[PDB]
């Protein structure tokens, strides 16, 4: 595809009175998950979730296991620090989420990097786009920001994101080339569903596509139907492809005023669909 991403997603959830926090880590290349770690699982190892990652030698699995376990410990500590910063009790359950990653172009060049945290579902701290300073969302987060400024955490993360992250992504793309580079276009069709004598639903379907990025829109007389479109979230089929549909309620007899529009990287050209009885 024209650009690619490598992303890791970390979730810690405290369990007061039931031991250490639940810690789940998942790694993705674009929309394809390739590793996982789960503190509840018996192996206590980073585990493969895509076939091409099993091409990695044993050094890899040992090293990635060491890092994700160290990460779990740090975010465990992080949950505690946050309780103190926010003056919250030890009785409540809380969530700490962390994401990082890099985007690179099809030319192999770095586009952007991310390194950011959320606490109980709200932005806590994030590396800004220029990778040189931090967006801290509230008073607590300024303490962390001052701490990370003094230790030059931004420079360490910039070096990681522009270096190892990109190197890793390129290597994964090579090893998983046969699947990771595909841009399968959506198979599209439209269905018609009468609601009454006055109205019917037109539903535009996109099926079998990868990557998940897609634009599915309705127009009426060449005009955006943004505030009258029912648009579901892009959803996994389970077999490595994605699905989406968009629908509009149209007055009987007015079907031909409507067109469905489909943009997807796999398409030679954007699609315009009409109801063809």
């Amino acid at each position: 595809a024209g650009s690619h991403s490598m992303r890791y997603f970390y979730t810690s959830v405290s369990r007061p009175g039931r031991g250490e926090p639940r810690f789940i880590a998942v790694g993705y290349v674009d929309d394809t998950q390739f590793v996982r770690f789960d503190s509840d699982a018996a192996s206590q190892r980073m585990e493969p979730r895509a076939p091409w990652i099993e091409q990695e030698g044993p050094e890899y699995w040992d090293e990635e296991t060491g890092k994700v376990k160290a990460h779990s410990q740090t975010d465990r500590e992080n949950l505690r620090i946050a309780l103190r910063y926010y003056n919250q009790s030890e009785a409540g359950s809380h969530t700490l989420q962390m994401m990082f990653g890099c985007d690179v172009g099809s030319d192999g060049r770095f586009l952007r990097g991310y390194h950011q945290y959320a606490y109980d579902g709200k932005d806590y701290i994030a590396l800004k786009e220029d990778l040189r300073s931090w967006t801290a969302a509230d008073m607590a987060a300024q303490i962390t920001k001052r701490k990370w400024e003094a230790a030059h955490v931004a420079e360490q993360q910039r070096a990681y994101l522009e270096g190892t992250c990109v190197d890793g992504l390129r290597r994964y793309l090579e090893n998983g080339k046969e699947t990771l580079q595909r841009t399968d276009p959506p198979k599209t069709h439209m269905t018609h569903h009468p609601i009454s004598d006055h109205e019917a639903t037109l539903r535009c379907w996109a099926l079998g596509f990868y990557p998940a990025e897609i634009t599915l829109t309705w127009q009426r007389d060449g005009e955006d139907q943004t505030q009258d479109t029912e648009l579901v979230e892009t959803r996994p089929a389970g077999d490595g492809t994605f699905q989406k549909w968009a629908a509009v309620v149209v007055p009987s007899g007015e079907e031909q005023r409507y067109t469905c529009h489909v943009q997807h990287e796999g398409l030679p050209k954007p699609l315009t669909l009409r109801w063809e009885p």
């Binding site: 910063y85 701490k147 230790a151 990681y160 890793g168």
Partner: peptide, 8 residues
């Protein structure tokens, strides 16, 4: 290949 994180 993952990076690292720091304490709050």
């Amino acid at each position: 290949r993952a990076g690292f994180v720091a304490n709050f």
